[PDB]
Every structure is written in C-alpha cells, then in structure tokens.
Amino acid sequence: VIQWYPGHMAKAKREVSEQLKKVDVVFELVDARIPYSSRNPMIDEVINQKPRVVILNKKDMSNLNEMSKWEQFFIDKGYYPVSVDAKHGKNLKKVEAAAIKATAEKFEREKAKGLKPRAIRAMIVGIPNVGKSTLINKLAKRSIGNKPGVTKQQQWIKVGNALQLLDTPGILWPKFEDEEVGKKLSLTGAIKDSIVHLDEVAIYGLNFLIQNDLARLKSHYNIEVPEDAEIIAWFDAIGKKRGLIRRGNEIDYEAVIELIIYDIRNAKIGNYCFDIFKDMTEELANDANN
Numbered sequence: 479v480i481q482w483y484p485g486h487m488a489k490a491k492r493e494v495s496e497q498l499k500k501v502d503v504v505f506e507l508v509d510a511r512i513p514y515s516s517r518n519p520m521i522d523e524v525i526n527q528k529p530r531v532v533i534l535n536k537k538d539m540s541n542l543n544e545m546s547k548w549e550q551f552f553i554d555k556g557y558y559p560v561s562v563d564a565k566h567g568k569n570l571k572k573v574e575a576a577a578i579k580a581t582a583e584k585f586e587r588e589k590a591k592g593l594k595p596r597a598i599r600a601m602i603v604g605i606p607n608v609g610k611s612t613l614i615n616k617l618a619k620r621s622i623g624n625k626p627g628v629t630k631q632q633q634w635i636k637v638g639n640a641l642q643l644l645d646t647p648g649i650l651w652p653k654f655e656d657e658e659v660g661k662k663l664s665l666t667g668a669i670k671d672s673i674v675h676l677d678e679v680a681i682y683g684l685n686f687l688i689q690n691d692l693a694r695l696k697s698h699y700n701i702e703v704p705e706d707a708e709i710i711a712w713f714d715a716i717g718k719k720r721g722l723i724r725r726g727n728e729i730d731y732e733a734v735i736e737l738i739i740y741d742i743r744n745a746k747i748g749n750y751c752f753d754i755f756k757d758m759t760e761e762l763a764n765d766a767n768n
C-alpha cells in the first residue's frame with residue numbers, strides 16, 4: 479500500500495526520471511483489464527520520448543479483443559505493446575523481443591557509428607499493483623538489504639540474451655482526478671483505498687456486467703431479475719440468493735457490496751476489459767494533444 483501526498487509524488491517523479499536516464503528502453507506496465515485507466519496521468523512527461531514497450535499484464539483476467547483495440551492505440555502512439563501473464567508465467571519471452579524492436583533504431587545508428595554491440599538496459603515503470611514486482615521476479619527466475627537498517631542497492635538482472643533489467647521498478651501514482659476512473663481502479667483493486675464509495679463502485683460494476691455479460695452475471699449468482707428493475711433489485715436478488723441478510727430478512731448491503739467487488743476484482747464472474755475503447759473516444763481526444 480502506498481500513501482500519496484504532494485511530497486511523495488514529487489519524490490517519485492524525480493526518482494523515476496533519474497532512473498530513466500540510465501536505460502535504453504522503458505517498460506510501462508499497465509493492467510490489461512484497464513490498459514488506459516491504469517496509466518499514470520503524467521506518464522508521457524516522465525518517460526519523455528524514451529523507447530517504450532507497453533506491457534499489458536494480467537491478460538488472463540481480461541478480454542483479448544478489447545485489449546487488441548488498446549494495443550492498436552499504443553501502436554499508433556509509436557509504442558511496442560505486448561500482453562503477458564506475469565503470475566502464471568505466460569508469454570514472457572516477448573518482453574526481451576519487444577525491447578529489441580523498440581531500441582532497434584538506436585542500436586542501428588550506434589553500429590553505423592562503429593560502436594560495440596551491448597546489452598539493452600531496461601526498467602519497469604507503473605502504478606501500484608499492476609504486477610511490477612511479480613514481473614521482475616518472474617524475469618529473474620528468483621525472488622528479488624535483508625539485515626534491518628541495511629540499504630538495498632539497485633542492481634541489473636540479466637534477462638535472456640540481450641537484456642539488462644533494473645531490479646527496482648519506478649512506482650508512480652494513479653489517475654486521481656476522475657470519478658469513473660476511480661471506479662475502474664477500485665474494481666480492478668488498483669486502489670483499495672477510500673474516497674470512492676464502495677456502493678457506487680459496486681453499482682458501476684453491476685451495470686458494466688448487465689450491459690456486457692448479462693447471462694453470465696445471472697448464471698453466476700443463479701438469479702433472474704426483471705429487466706425494468708432498478709439496480710437495487712440486483713443487490714436484493716443476490717443478497718437473498720446468498721442468504722446475506724440481517725434483522726429478519728432485510729438485505730445486508732455491506733456484505734452484498736463486498737461480495738460483488740470481490741467477484742469482479744478476482745475475475746470470479748468473467749474476464750473483462752473495463753476500458754471500452756469505443757466509449758472513451760472523447761476522453762482520448764481530450765488527453766491527446768498535450
């Protein structure tokens with residue numbers, strides 16, 4: 479868990495920019511469930527045109543077709559997007575491959591100038607909980623000061639044939655300013671922190687599922703709900719079917735909310751991408767010119 483406050487943010491920006499000076503390529507790690515909303519709002523100013531591999535992690539918990547629309551988006555920005563499952567170790571060899579492609583022009587011009595070939599230096603950057611330390615551990619094939627009061631120095635990890643990876647990720651803050659992004663981040667568990675009401679997060683999640691995977695929602699909770707019912711009827715049908723009740727047969731809404739949030743966060747109902755590309759056209763247009 480990370481506590482953001484202005485000074486911590488300024489320190490994070492400073493330190494990540496500094497680390498970025500030591501590398502050839504940056505791996506921006508995002509959640510495949512929200513490839514756009516799980517980005518740091520200042521990521522392009524921090525990265526500052528450094529060759530970029532965008533890694534869509536937790537692909538196992540998302541929708542591939544939707545992810546492909548985001549990959550196309552990143553491609554159009556001049557980045558090299560790849561999707562992985564860092565936890566279950568699926569598709570990792572493509573990280574090095576992507577790095578080689580992203581830095582190919584730099585190293586071609588070095589070879590033209592008569593410089594010796596050399597290992598690619600990379601670092602991973604992203605918001606909390608997108609899977610940075612998981613990915614680093616997996617790429618090192620080992621868990622990455624162990625005496626109290628002894629300070630860890632940053633080190634390079636040999637990865638594959640061509641890649642040196644900084645063993646310490648740059649950690650940046652999530653988008654804060656927008657309430658729908660707040661809900662998306664809470665639904666993926668990127669922020670398990672207050673000042674976004676859980677009941678509203680649960681409502682958002684349920685509505686997402688009603689619109690995009692209604693049969694699955696119903697079969698998962700084994701419920702059937704009138705299509706003209708308001709969202710409260712969904713909380714009630716779930717609560718009643720699961721016996722989440724209190725004070726006779728009133729619905730324990732806190733418990734229903736927690737169950738819905740848990741099931742969406744842990745992909746118990748399905749594998750969804752909550753950044754719907756075609757619904758985010760205006761947001762993308764606003765963010766773009768910068």
Ligand SMILES: Nc1nc2c(ncn2[C@@H]2O[C@H](COP(=O)(O)OP(=O)(O)O)[C@@H](O)[C@H]2O)c(=O)[nH]1
Pocket residue numbers: 535536537538539562563564565566605606607608609610611612613
């Ligand atoms: N299902 C799944 N879980 C993942 C993946 N990468 C990380 N996780 C899990 O997501 C949580 C956050 O991972 P973590 O590496 O600590 O994120 P970090 O804050 O960016 O270093 C952990 O519980 C991981 O086990 C993935 O690719 N698939």
